[PDB]
């Protein structure tokens, strides 16, 4: 059930230090696996490097909590 | 002729303060118009806000120089 999984993805991403909401999430099933692409909000005053670190942290947190995800790309934008 | 136009796009983007190369460019014709998506390199120590400013500057510079472009999305990544 896809919406239960999308809710978990958003919730997991929001628990990571430096996340200021989920701006966009597209998730699809490839068989029983999820492939997802996400855009997180960050403080516009973070550096590009810090934003990259937050994205990597989100990728790790979300993939760790949701075992069916087999591909997750995380980008950032000011909010 | 597409490659002449791609070269112009890259050259125009590289002339904008804060651009550290063109990491990716995908350009396609929709009729006689170009639709393009680009990723520029930036200083990892720029803020997210500064990176956004550079992207907007690139969009303005490239669209101003290359009149056939009707859609241009510019994102940034550390280099």
Numbering used by the authors:
A (entry chain A), B (entry chain A): 213 to 291
Sentences from the paper on this structure:
One group of metal ion efflux transporters that regulates metal ion homeostasis and can be found in all domains of life is the Cation Diffusion Facilitator (CDF) protein family. One of the most highly conserved and abundant integral MM proteins is the CDF transporter MamM. MamM was recently proposed to function as a magnetosome-directed iron transporter required for iron biomineralization since its deletion abolished magnetite biomineralization and mutation of residues within the conserved TMD metal-binding site resulted in alterations of magnetite crystal size, morphology and even mineral phase. To summarize our results we present an alternative model for the CDF CTD mode of action, in which we propose that upon metal cation binding, the CTD induces conformational changes towards a tighter and more compact fold which allows the activation of iron transport through the TMD.
Examining this closed state model, three putative binding sites were revealed, in which Asp, Glu and His residues from the two monomers are brought into close proximity and may bind divalent cations. The other two symmetrical peripheral binding sites contain His264 and Glu289 residues but no designated binding cavity was found. In contrast, E289A from the peripheral binding sites resulted in a significantly lower magnetic response that correlated with a significantly lower number of magnetite particles per cell (−17%; P<0.01, Mann-Whitney test). However, size and shape of the particles were unaffected in E289A mutants. Furthermore, only the D249A and E289A single mutants revealed an additional slight decrease of the magnetic response during iron induction experiments with iron-starved cells. Whereas, only in the E289A mutant was the number of binding sites significantly reduced (2.0±0.2). Since Glu289 is located at the domain surface, it is more likely to have a role in peripheral binding site stabilization and metal ion coordination than the relatively buried His264. To confirm that these observed phenotypic differences are due to true transport function alternations, we also examined the expression levels of all MamM mutants, their ability to stabilize MamB expression, performed MD simulations for dimer stability evaluation and determined their CTD structures. (ii) All mutants exhibited an apo-MamM CTD-like behavior along the MD simulations, and (iii) an absence of structural differences was observed.
